[PDB]
C-alpha cells in the first residue's frame, strides 16, 4: 500500500505527506521517468537509454544523434526515439536545448504511450506552472522555447490535433522549468534530465526529511529522518554547497518562491562557507564556471589543470571549508580518479572529508558517495584499517540514502567484504 499521499498544503500548493510512520532508509516511492534525455555535456559520452558511460558508443544510423552502449539499448530505445529521430535529422546541424528535446518526448509519450506509472500520484497535466509569478523576462524566454519546439518538431507535429487535448506549449515549458529533475549517475555526475510527475509533489526544504537518488533513469525516494503520520515530506531541490543568498536566487528564479525555513532565516552556515580572503574566493567562484563547464563535458585533463592552478597556486589560497575551494577539490578528485591518478585523487578526496561532514548533515547521498570513493582509493592503496572505517561510514549513510534497491550498495558490499578479508588475513 502507499506510505505516502498527496494533500493540499496551507501555503505551498500541493504536497506529499506520510500515511504511516517512516524510519530513515525506508523506501517511499520509486519511478521511471515520464520522459528523459541525456544532457548537453554527456551527449555522445553516455548511453541515451541507460545513461552509463562507454569508451565507444553506437550511433543511430538515421539521425546519428542518439548514441547507445549496446544493440539491446538501441533497440529498446527505438519506440521512444522513433519520432524524435526524424526531427533531430531534419534539423541536422542544430541541436535543441535539453528542455525542448525533453518536452518532445513528453508529447510523444502522452500521445502514443499507455498511461505511465510515473503519473500515478500526480500527472504532467497537474504540474505547477507558476505562470502568475513569472517575470516578463522569464515569459520572453518561454516564448522563445515554444518557437524552438515548433521549429524542431515540425516534421512530427504540425497542428494541435497532434498534441494532447488543450495542450498549451507555453504552459508546458513553464511546468518544465520548475519540475525538471537532474539525473545523476552512480558517481553523482549529472548525465540527464527527466520528468517524474509523482515525485514533483514533494516540496523543498533546505533541511529535508527525504532524499532522492538515481540508478540510471530510475528514481528512488527514501526517508532520511524519522517522519510522523501526517508530516509533510520534503527534499532539497538544491546543491548543499550554496549560501542562503545563492539559494534565494535559484528558488526565486527557477521555482518562484521565498524560503521561510530556519536555515534561511538565520543564514545557517553561510559564514563558515565563505571563510578566507574574499578577493581570492571571488576569483575561484568565477573560475568554477569554466571548470564546471569542462567537467559537464567530461574533459578531465582540462578540469585537473585548472583545479591544480588553484589548489597549488603560487598566490593566496583558501581554507578547504570554503565552498568554492571545496568544489575545486571535488572536481580535482573526480578528474584524478577518471585519469588514473589515484594517489593525487586520495589527497584531494581526504581533504574534502571534514567539510563534507559539516555541510551534508545526517544522511545525504552525495556524502555517502564521496566517502565511498575515498574508502575505495584507500583500499586499493593498501590502507586497510582506514579504508574499512570509511567504507563502513559510507555504508551507514548509503543504507539510508541508496538502499538495497540501488545497485551501488551491492558494489559497496563487495568492497566491504574485500577489505574485511584483508584485515582477517592478519
Ligand atoms: C516540484 S513542485 C512541488 C509541488 C507543488 N507545490 C505543486 O503544487 O505541484 C515545485 C513548486 O512547489 C512550490 N514550493 C515548493 N517548495 C516550496 C516551499 N518550501 N515553500 C513554498 N513554496 C514551495 C513552488 O511553487 C515550486 O515552484
Ligand atoms: C495553490 N497554488 C498553486 N499554485 C499557486 S501559484 N501559481 O504558485 O500562485 C498557488
Ligand atoms: C520537481 N523537482 C525539481 N527539482 C527537484 S530535485 N529535488 O532537484 O530533484 C524536484
Ligand atoms: Zn545502454
Ligand atoms: Zn535516430
Ligand atoms: Zn530555506
Alpha-carbon span 395 to 397, nearest angstrom: 5
Q: What's the domain range around 89?
A: 34-179
How many Å lie between the centroid of ligand 2 and the Cα of residue 11? 8
Smallest-distance ligand from the CA of 206: 6
Closest CA to 319 of 277, 269, 347, 288: 277
- Cβ 184 vs Cβ 53: under 8 Å: no
Burial label, 31 (beta-carbon count in 10 A; 0-12, 13-18, 19+): buried
Write b or e for each residue in 139-153: b if 16 or more Cβ atoms lie within 10 A of its Cβ, otherwise e.
eeebeebbebbeebb
Given in angstroms, what resolution was this structure solved at? 1.8
CATH at residue 125:
1.10.220.160
CATH at residue 261:
2.170.270.10
Residue owning the nearest CA to atom 8 of ligand 2: 130
**Helix (H), strand (E) at residue 79:** helix 78-90
Grid cell locating 177: 522549468
User: What residue spans of 113-185 are helical by DSSP H?
Assistant: 136-152, 169-179
Does 336 carry a binding-site annotation?
A: no
Grid cell locating 312: 597549488
DSSP character at residue 194: E
User: What residue spans of 312-380 are helical by DSSP H?
Assistant: 323-339, 342-351, 353-359, 365-380
Q: For residue 229, give Cα distances in angstroms to 200, 205, 237, 408, 413.
A: 20, 18, 23, 30, 33
**122 and 159 share one domain:** yes
Alpha-carbon span 413 to 36, nearest angstrom: 30
Closest CA to 51 of 61, 62, 41, 63: 41
Q: For residue 142, give Cα distances in angstroms to 108, 162, 259.
A: 20, 21, 24
How many Å lie between the centroid of ligand 2 and the Cα of residue 192? 28
How many Å lie between the centroid of ligand 4 and the Cα of residue 73? 5
Alpha-carbon span 18 to 232, nearest angstrom: 7
- Cβ 316 vs Cβ 280: under 8 Å: yes
**328 and 340 share one domain:** yes
Q: What angle do CA 210, 327, 295 make, to 5 degrees?
A: 95
Among 349, 379, 406, residue at a domain's last position: 349
Closest CA to 104 of 57, 65, 61: 65
Sign of the CA dihedral with 8 first, then 201, 198, and 77 last? positive
Pocket of ligand 3 (CB under 6 A): 179-181, 200, 212, 235, 237
Task: Provide the domain count of the chain.
Answer: 4
Q: For residue 89, give Cα distances in angstroms to 40, 117, 412.
A: 17, 31, 42
**88 and 171 share one domain:** yes
Residue owning the nearest CA to atom 7 of ligand 2: 130
Residue owning the nearest CA to atom 3 of ligand 2: 13
Sign of the CA dihedral with 213 first, then 15, 116, and 38 last? negative
- Cβ 65 vs Cβ 95: under 8 Å: yes
Asked, for residue 216, whether it belongs to a domain, the answer is: no
Residues with CB under 5 A from ligand 5 (ion): 60, 62-63, 66, 85
Alpha-carbon span 4 to 21, nearest angstrom: 10
Residue owning the nearest CA to atom 13 of ligand 1: 12
The phi, psi pair for 190, rounded to 5°, reads: -65, 130
Grid cell locating 244: 542562503
- Cβ 194 vs Cβ 36: under 8 Å: yes
List all residues 6 or more positions away from 250 whose beta carbon is below 8 Å from its beta carbon: 238, 242
**98 and 49 share one domain:** yes
How many Å lie between the centroid of ligand 1 and the Cα of residue 204? 7
Alpha-carbon span 297 to 47, nearest angstrom: 14
How many Å lie between the centroid of ligand 3 and the Cα of residue 348? 29
**49 and 171 share one domain:** yes
**56 and 171 share one domain:** yes
CB atoms within 10 A of CB 55: 5
Helix (H, G, I), strand (E, B) or coil at 211: strand
**47 and 169 share one domain:** yes
- Cβ 87 vs Cβ 152: under 8 Å: yes
Name 18's bridge partners: 4
CATH at residue 404:
1.25.40.10
**19 and 96 share one domain:** no
Closest CA to 25 of 5, 51, 3, 50: 3
Asked, for residue 184, whether it belongs to a domain, the answer is: no
Smallest-distance ligand from the CA of 129: 2
Asked, for residue 364, whether it belongs to a domain, the answer is: yes
How many Å lie between the centroid of ligand 4 and the Cα of residue 349? 29
Alpha-carbon span 372 to 19, nearest angstrom: 33
Residues with CB under 5 A from ligand 6 (ion): 206, 259, 261, 263-264
Closest CA to 214 of 232, 241, 235: 235
CA of 236, closest atom in ligand 3: 7
- Cβ 257 vs Cβ 251: under 8 Å: yes
How many Å lie between the centroid of ligand 3 and the Cα of residue 199? 8
DSSP character at residue 241: S
Asked, for residue 92, whether it belongs to a domain, the answer is: yes
**Helix (H), strand (E) at residue 304:** helix 300-311
List all residues 6 or more positions away from 199 whose beta carbon is below 8 Å from its beta carbon: 29, 31, 181, 212, 219, 221
Asked, for residue 189, whether it belongs to a domain, the answer is: no
Pocket of ligand 1 (CB under 6 A): 12-15, 127-128, 130, 178-179, 200-201, 203-204, 255-257, 259
CA 216 distance to own-chain centroid: 11
Residue for cell digits 551507514? 396
Closest CA to 410 of 383, 372, 378, 355: 372
Among 306, 322, 349, residue at a domain's last position: 349
Asked, for residue 170, whether it belongs to a domain, the answer is: yes
**112 and 39 share one domain:** yes
Task: Say how many residues make up the chain.
Answer: 426
Among 326, 349, 372, residue at a domain's last position: 349
CA of 128, closest atom in ligand 2: 4
Asked, for residue 186, whether it belongs to a domain, the answer is: no
Q: For residue 307, give Cα distances in angstroms to 3, 109, 188, 328.
A: 45, 42, 19, 6
Experimental technique? X-ray
The HSE-up count of residue 392 (CA atoms within 13 Å, CB side) is 8
Helix (H, G, I), strand (E, B) or coil at 364: coil
**92 and 39 share one domain:** yes
List all residues 6 or more positions away from 271 whose beta carbon is below 8 Å from its beta carbon: none
Residues with CB under 5 A from ligand 4 (ion): 47, 49-50, 69, 73
Does 69 carry a binding-site annotation?
A: yes
Grid cell locating 53: 558511460
DSSP character at residue 126: G
Residue owning the nearest CA to atom 2 of ligand 2: 13
Query: Given the DSSP bridges, would you call strands 210-215 and 203-204 parallel, antiparallel or unpaired?
Result: unpaired
Asked, for residue 19, whether it belongs to a domain, the answer is: yes
**392 and 421 share one domain:** yes
Closest CA to 270 of 292, 241, 236: 241
CATH at residue 330:
1.25.40.970
**287 and 261 share one domain:** no
Counting DSSP H helices and E strands in the chain, the numbers are: 16, 12
Query: Given the DSSP bridges, would you call strands 234-235 and 203-204 parallel, antiparallel or unpaired?
Result: parallel
Amino acid at each position: 500500500p502507499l506510505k505516502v499521499e498527496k494533500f493540499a498544503t496551507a501555503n505551498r500548493g500541493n504536497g506529499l505527506r506520510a500515511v504511516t510512520p517512516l524510519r530513515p532508509g525506508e523506501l517511499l516511492f520509486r519511478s521511471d521517468p515520464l520522459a528523459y534525455t541525456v544532457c548537453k555535456g554527456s551527449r555522445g559520452v553516455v548511453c541515451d537509454r541507460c545513461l552509463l558511460g562507454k569508451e565507444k558508443l553506437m550511433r543511430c544510423s538515421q539521425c546519428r544523434v542518439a548514441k547507445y552502449c549496446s544493440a539491446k539499448c538501441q533497440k529498446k530505445a527505438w519506440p521512444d526515439h522513433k519520432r524524435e529521430c526524424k526531427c533531430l535529422k531534419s534539423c541536422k546541424p542544430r541541436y535543441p536545448p535539453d528542455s525542448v528535446r525533453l518536452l518532445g518526448r513528453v508529447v510523444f509519450k502522452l500521445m502514443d504511450g499507455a498511461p505511465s506509472e510515473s503519473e500515478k500520484l500526480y500527472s504532467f497535466y497537474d504540474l505547477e506552472s507558476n505562470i502568475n509569478k513569472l517575470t516578463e523576462d522569464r515569459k520572453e524566454g518561454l516564448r522563445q522555447l515554444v518557437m524552438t519546439f515548433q521549429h524542431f518538431m515540425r516534421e512530427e507535429i504540425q497542428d494541435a490535433s497532434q498534441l494532447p487535448p488543450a495542450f498549451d506549449l507555453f504552459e508546458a515549458f513553464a511546468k518544465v522549468i520548475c519540475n525538471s529533475f537532474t539525473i545523476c549517475n552512480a558517481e553523482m555526475q549529472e548525465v540527464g534530465v527527466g520528468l517524474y510527475p509523482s515525485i514533483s509533489l514533494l516540496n523543498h526544504s533546505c533541511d529535508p526529511n527525504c532524499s532522492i537518488v538515481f540508478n540510471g533513469p530510475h528514481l528512488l525516494l527514501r526517508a532520511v529522518r524519522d517522519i510522523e503520520v501526517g508530516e509533510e515530506l520534503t527534499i532539497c531541490y538544491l546543491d548543499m554547497l550554496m549560501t542562503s543568498e545563492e539559494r534565494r536566487k535559484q528558488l526565486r528564479d527557477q521555482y518562484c518562491f521565498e524560503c521561510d525555513c530556519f536555515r534561511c532565516q538565520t543564514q545557517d552556515k553561510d559564514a563558515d562557507m565563505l571563510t578566507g580572503d574574499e578577493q581570492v574566493w571571488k576569483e575561484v567562484q568565477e573560475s568554477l564556471k569554466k571548470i564546471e563547464e569542462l567537467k559537464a563535458h567530461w574533459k578531465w585533463e582540462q578540469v585537473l589543470a585548472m583545479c591544480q592552478a588553484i589548489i597549488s597556486s603560487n598566490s593566496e589560497r583558501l581554507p578547504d571549508i570554503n565552498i568554492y575551494q571545496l568544489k575545486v577539490l571535488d572536481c580535482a578528485m573526480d578528474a584524478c580518479i577518471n585519469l588514473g591518478l589515484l594517489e593525487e585523487a586520495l589527497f584531494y578526496g581526504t581533504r574534502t572529508m571534514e567539510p563534507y561532514r559539516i555541510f551534508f548533515p545526517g544522511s545525504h547521498p552525495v556524502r555517502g558517495v564521496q566517502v565511498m570513493k575515498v574508502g575505495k582509493l584507500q583500499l586499493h592503496q593498501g590502507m586497510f584499517p582506514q579504508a574499512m572505517k570509511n567504507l563502513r561510514l559510507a555504508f551507514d549513510i548509503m543504507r539510508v540514502t541508496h538502499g538495497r534497491e540501488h545497485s551501488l550498495i551491492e558494489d559497496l558490499i563487495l568492497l566491504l567484504e574485500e577489505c574485511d578479508a584483508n584485515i582477517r588475513a592478519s
